[PDB]
Fold:
Amino acid sequence: IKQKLETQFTCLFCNHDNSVVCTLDKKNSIGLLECKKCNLSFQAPINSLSQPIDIYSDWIDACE
Amino acid sequence: FGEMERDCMIAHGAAGFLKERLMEASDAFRVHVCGICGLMSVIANLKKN
Amino acid sequence: WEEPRLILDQPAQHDNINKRYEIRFGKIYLSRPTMTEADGTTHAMFPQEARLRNLTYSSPVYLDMEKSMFTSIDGNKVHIGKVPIMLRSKFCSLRTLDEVDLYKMKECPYDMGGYFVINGSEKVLIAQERSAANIVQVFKKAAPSPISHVAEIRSALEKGSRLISTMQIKLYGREDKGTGRTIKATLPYVKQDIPIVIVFRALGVVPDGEILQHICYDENDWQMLEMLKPCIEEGFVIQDKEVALDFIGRRGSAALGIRREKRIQYAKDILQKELLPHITQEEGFETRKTFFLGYMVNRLLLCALERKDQDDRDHFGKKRLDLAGPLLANLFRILFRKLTREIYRYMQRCIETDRDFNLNLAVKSTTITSGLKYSLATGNWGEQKKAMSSRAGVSQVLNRYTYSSTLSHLRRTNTPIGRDGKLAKPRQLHNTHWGLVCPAETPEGQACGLVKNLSLLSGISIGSPSEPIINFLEEWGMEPLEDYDPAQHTKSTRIFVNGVWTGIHRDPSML
Amino acid sequence: EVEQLLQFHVATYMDNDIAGQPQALQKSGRPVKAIRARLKGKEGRLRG
Amino acid sequence: LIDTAVKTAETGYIQRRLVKALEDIMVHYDGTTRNSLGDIIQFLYGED
Amino acid sequence: ERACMLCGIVLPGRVFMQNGCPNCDSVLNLRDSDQATVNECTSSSFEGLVAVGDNEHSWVAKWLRVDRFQPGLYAVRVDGRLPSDIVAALEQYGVYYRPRDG
Amino acid sequence: PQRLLIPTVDDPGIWGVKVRLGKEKDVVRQILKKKLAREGTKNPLEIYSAFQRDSFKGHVYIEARKAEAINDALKGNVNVFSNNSKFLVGIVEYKDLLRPVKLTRGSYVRVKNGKFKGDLAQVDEVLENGLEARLKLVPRLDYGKDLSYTSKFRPAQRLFSEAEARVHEIRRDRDGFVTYGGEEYYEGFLYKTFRLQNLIVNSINPTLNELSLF
DNA sequence: CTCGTGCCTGGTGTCTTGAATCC
DNA sequence: GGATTACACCCAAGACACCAGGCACGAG
RNA sequence: CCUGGUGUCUUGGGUG
Ligand SMILES: [Zn+2]
Ligand SMILES: [Zn+2]
Ligand SMILES: [Zn+2]
Structure:
């Protein structure tokens, strides 16, 4: 079953903190970051061990 | 006079003795209460009565 | 020399002129104990005066300090405090004198010393019992837990001898419950348990076949191999070093947002240091940690396979006694850093005035002197503001009721387990106490069985450098760890020196 | 920050064993003896 | 020596809870055995 | 440290004696004064320390009316006022004193 | 006019940051050094200003355009709490952060220092420069009785008595004015200069004893 | 005689990161 | 996640820190 | 010429 989790991460674009939601679909190995404020979305591959800090880390490197 | 000595006097049924030990032979105090609200809020000047 | 230099820096733009301010601590010198009156006059202090006038029998300590001043456009004997002297030791004014003159100093020749004098009161240090460092212990876990066996080790360096960190390897999965029976480890400063295979890959050894060649030295043992099966599959998708190191860094108590380009380089420190620091801390020696990690997993499974009993926590060979020496070093270490930070905080104000500091105004001897006096007088082992959580009762007033009682009191040992925790295991007289602690002498009441007393012929090891022992082992045939293969070495004996696996030898009987 | 601090002092004045947060301390370093701690335990008002 | 020193506090706690459970139980003049609420515990003390 | 009453800059007092005020000395001439003069134009008493790094684009600097001055430490409030004789002399120079004492 | 200098949406943001109590000025200093040292380099510190208000203990305010610059300004600062505790200030709150804020001859003040600490005094006059004020005070004297002072071992208050001084231990200066032990007493009151910073002018509460006397 | 430095007393205010079973 | 963990008694052994301001003494 | 106040909080060591 999918996991819809709220986090305390800051969006890299709109800078609103505590407004990034992480949807981890392990059945298809696809993780999804969403911003509850400005509405952006970032997708990245996840394994079985990953957690909201794993894809949020991949989002920091995808920008820089 | 600890908790276990208290129990022994109950077993003897010596209720009168236990009362005296814990009051007259120790820290007995007189307070005034209000018959309406039941608090110890009474201001009592005894020489002015 | 544990932190031998203080360093400052300012990139002068106010014509940049990096001006590093540096202070180096050198030789230590000791003087005999001296009474300095309010007058200013000084004389040698002997103990009888110290008892009578409620003084502290202590020696002034002087430390060489050296200033240096790097400047790039792009001292002498400072007094640091007084250390209480143990009577009849080599630094006590009674050690000489000779029997005739002892009587003139009002000292009794039957008084054998071994204690301190603090504000006129005689204080003796009580030996503190602790578990050995750098040894693997395996224990079983209670029924309502997903863990069944745990391996534990507290790692502590050889120099100084001081604690560093603690590490655990837990085997999950109950009896027919817990599904995949995998194994995860616990690392210092990481919030979550990490599977074993991942940390093996994170050290530079990644294909399965090499990993199993580091742990199990018996290819036939299919029971052991079947228990490592789920560990491979739960860490299969992590197939190289870089994504392994990053998986670690994403848990290690840091800040949020240090990116992959650096979050690896932060985790490489948590692996190089803090994780098993007793083996080595220099770079390019990760072969020793990988080999040691395999040994741990091997020991863990032997207990889970019921081929070896769990370790007996009360076996006296797994125990150590901290006496006056080691106990003072741990306290002196804490206080010397406190003195250091007060020097550092004072330089940042006194150099903004650009005035040469007279050094003697930047060393407040009250930090060490009051620190040692307070802890020896109360027994509170720590900084005064942190009196709780610190251990109590390490120092006690020396019982002088009778002569026998003085001898017993100076030879007492204490196990600091508590009064909380009933049971029996630390309180029982264990078989391995034979000849080392008295089987008869123990207090009645709450301390019964926890406070013990050294047998008449006991001694305590003072400590010895391990470096000459290594040289002797290699001269007589010990082979390095890079030359070792379980297929070729299916029968040789492993050699440990202070708990670190250092080599292998094929003919142990002659050695 | 100032209103929460008034709430804090009034709380630890009555009960200084609130779970999940650090105890109020005296300058000597030892915890403050709140009213709740006066009544409980072997030496408090009721059992002692 | 350990057993005597340990298990004395085990039984000491046992006796304390027993006394508080039973302290208010009194025989009344009708032969019933009652607590302070007047609940009947036995209709006749010791059944005899 | 003292604060210039005219511009609000915070400097070691001897600086006011050595170099004058870096913002004001064209009119205040503290460099060529005595200590009595320096102490009448600068105050040992001030509050609200402000690091101004970018005078000309800082809103904080514009509010404090230090946006035309040099980067440095400034004070929100400077106690005391310029002596009436110095205020009169500044006014002769086309300089209008707006007190910084609140 | 000050009203034309109000902030707008085009102005930089201001963040507050929690710092160790008593270290607010140090942090402001440290930020300035970092700013000036990095000016013109490839990695300038992109803050405009920083400040600390006494009334707001434990806080520094920092002016910038991006939050990342706030983190940059504070990086490595030992006086700053490592928790990611900065907070945003609203434009409508900016000027109040920079608000800068009595004493009249004949009014009462309370002395804050010396043997007269806590005593009520009348303001008689102030120095030309504007720093110390001459105060009229009920003296606390001993007439040299035990000579061969502190606020804990001082004397009771009582008007100066020149005939007592004449008898026991004095220079006449004018009608009703004597200099006694190098202090001036006029009609029984001490007249002594105090720093204005050494007197309290606000929220004074006269005591029972002061209502009886004055 | 004046200025500067050091010492003592009084008032105000905290923080580098570091024992076990049961319900 | 806390709360529970015998009773009474004896005796010896201890105690805030740092910073700023003011006053006094010494030297120029 | 009757009244008449000397500490606390801990820690440690002991007794049954
Ligand atoms: Zn967003
Ligand atoms: Zn009423
Ligand atoms: Zn100016």
